[PDB]
Symmetry: D2
Subunit: 188 residues, 4 copies
C-alpha cells in the first residue's frame, strides 16, 4: 500500500480567474488527475491533499514573491474539477487527509512524514501543480526522507513548458523516480 | 523579543472532571501560569498555545494504547483552563498570539513551530504548562537540539508525581542549561 | 529488520580514570552490553556505535559550560570499554556495523542515523549504553518522534543517579511505549 | 555574520579526468570560486566545505544506481580543485573553516550544518559550487525551508547543462527570493 499526494490542485492555481493561475496546461490535466486519484483510492492507497493555506502575513518570505493566493476561508482553496467531486464522496474516509501547508513542500512544517511513517508507507505518488515549484520541493524532501517516488506525468503541470521538462528530467535522472501514467503504469 | 510556549493547559489536563487530569498540582499553578502569560504578552513577546488535538479510534497513533482518550477535537476538554482561557478570549486574535494543534508530546513534532520562531528570529523560548516530565520535557529537549535558549517558569509547570517534576527541573538546569524563572520572569537561584 | 544502538560506552564515561565517568554502575553493565551486542550481530541486526566527538575548547557548544572536557577527538577516552571494544576490532569492517560521531546527547541530532535506518527499512531500534537519563533518554525520544518501535536493554543501560535511571525506565515504558528487554533480548514483565 | 558554503568543488566533479566531471563549465569558475571564498574568509565569515563522501558497493544508497562511482572515501577524487585546494591547505585548521562529509545532494541532509549555523546565530548563507541544478539546488531549497536568507554567487556556480543552470538561477531568484551576487559579493541587478 502506497500514498498519493495531491498538491495544490485548486481554483486559484487552475481556474481562468484564479489568483495564481497556471491556465491552460493546468486545466488540461483535470481528467487525468481525477482518474489517477480515484484509481489509487480504489487500490487501497492513502490520499493526502496538501494545500496552500496563506494569510497579510508580513513574516512569510513568499508574500514578497507572489500575489495573494489560496487564502484561508476563500473559494480559491476549493479543488478544481472532478477531483473536488472525489473529495465530496470520500473526504471523510480514514484514508483521506486534508493538510494545510505554508511552504512549497508538502513536508515542510506539516505532519506528513509522521502520518506516512505511522502507516509504514515506503512509496509516494506525486500529482498536482506546479511541476517545478510545489511538486519539485515535495519530491526533493521525499527523496531526502528516503521514500521511493512515483510521478504521474499526465497529472502534473506548470505554466512554463521548459520548466516542466527540467523537473521531469530531474525526477527521473537525479531523484531516481518512476514516471507513470494515469493508470499508474510505468512509462518508457 | 522572546516566545512563550503554553503547553496543554486545558480542562482535560487540569479540571477535576478532566479525562487525563493531573489534579491538585495542575490546578495550583493556575494563578502563576495566567500571570506569566499576561506579563509576556504585555512586554511584546509571542505567545504559542500548543495544544493536543487527538481523535478517538486513531489506531495508527502509538499514544492511543498508552493513555485514555483526551483533548478530543470539538470537545470542551480542549478549552483552556482558568484565567488563561480568559486571556485567549481577549487577545487570541492578536498577530502575536497563536494556536497550534499537536499530536505528539513535543510542541515541535509535526508542527510549524520552528518555522514560525525562525521567521521572527526568536532565540529564546519560555516554557509553561503540563506535564513537566512529558510534553514540557519533550518540548525542551527538541528546543535544545534546535539551538534555542530555554527558560522554564518553575511555578507555571506541573506534574502528577513530585519525583518526576523534580527530575525534569534538574534535567532542564543541569543537562539542557535552561534558566529557571518565577512568574515574574525573574531568574531563580 | 532491527538495529542496535550502542551509546557512549567509552573509557571517558566508564573507566575509573575517565573524564566524565559514571564509575561503578557503568562498569557493572560491561558483561551484559557486550553480550547483547554480539547476540544482535549474530541475529543479523545492524549495529550503530554512536559516540560523543567533542573538541577542546568548543566555544559555540552549550554543553561546554555544563560538563568538563570529555570524549575528545583523537584521544584514548573515545575508545570503547571492555569486550565491546574487542567486538568492534573484530567486526567493525563488516557492512552491518557502523561508527557514528555525534555532538549532542541524542544519536539522531545532526547525524545521518535516521537516513541509514530508512535506507534499510528498519522499524525497531534497540538501545544500550550511557547515561540512561541523558544520551539514552534523548535518543529514545527522538526515535519515538521519528516513528520507530523501541526496545531498551535494561541490564545494558546505566546512570550515575539511581533515581534518574528509574525515571527513565518508567518514561520509556509508560510514555514512549518501549519494550524493556534483557541481555538475551527477551521481554521483561 | 554570514556563512559561505562550498559545495562539491572537487577533482571528480571538475577535472577533465574526474569520475563524474561537469568539465569545462566547472573548470571555468575556478578563479571566481577561489576568489569569493578568500574574500568571505577575510571578511570574517564562516566557511563550510560540504563534500560528497561515497563508498563503493553501497547498495543501500539510491544514488548508486543513478551515477557511476564518484568522490570515494580516501581517493584523490575528493581533493578540492584549483586555488580552493590551496586555500584549504593554508587555512583548513582555522576555527572558522569546516570540512563536512555528506551522502545526499543537499549539504543539510544527514549533516550537522544547521546545528553549527544556529550555534553561531547565522541568518544568511552564501552558496557556491557544483552542480547548480543538483547539490546547489537541493542545498538552497533546504536553506529556504530552514528560514535562512540566501545569496548565490552566480559566477561561482556551474552545471554541465546550460539550460539547467538557467532554470536554477531563475528558481533561486523568483521562488526562493535569493539574492544573486558576484565574486566581490556585490548584488547583481
Ligand atoms: Zn503559496
Ligand atoms: Zn496526548
Ligand atoms: Zn558530551
Ligand atoms: Zn554524489
Amino acid at each position: 500500500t502506497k500514498a498519493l499526494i495531491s498538491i495544490d490542485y485548486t481554483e486559484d492555481f487552475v481556474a481562468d480567474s484564479g489568483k495564481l493561475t497556471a491556465g491552460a496546461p493546468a486545466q488540461a490535466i483535470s481528467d487525468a488527475i481525477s482518474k489517477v486519484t480515484r484509481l489509487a483510492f480504489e487500490r487501497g492507497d492513502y490520499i493526502f491533499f496538501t494545500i496552500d493555506a496563506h494569510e497579510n502575513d508580513c513574516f512569510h518570505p513568499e508574500s514578497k514573491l507572489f500575489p495573494p493566493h489560496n487564502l484561508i476561508g476563500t473559494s480559491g482553496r476549493n479543488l478544481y474539477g472532478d477531483l473536488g467531486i472525489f473529495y465530496q464522496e470520500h473526504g471523510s474516509d480514514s484514508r483521506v487527509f486534508w493538510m494545510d501547508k505554508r511552504h512549497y513542500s508538502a513536508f515542510s512544517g506539516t505532519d506528513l512524514d509522521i502520518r506516512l511513517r505511522e502507516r509504514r508507507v515506503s512509496t509516494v505518488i506525486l500529482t498536482g501543480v506546479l511541476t517545478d515549484i510545489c511538486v519539485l520541493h515535495t519530491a526533493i524532501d521525499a527523496y531526502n526522507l528516503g521514500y521511493d517516488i512515483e510521478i504521474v506525468k499526465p497529472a502534473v503541470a506548470s505554466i512554463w513548458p521548459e520548466n516542466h521538462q527540467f523537473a521531469l528530467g530531474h525526477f527521473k535522472n537525479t531523484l531516481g523516480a518512476k514516471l507513470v501514467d494515469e493508470n499508474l503504469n510505468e512509462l518508457f
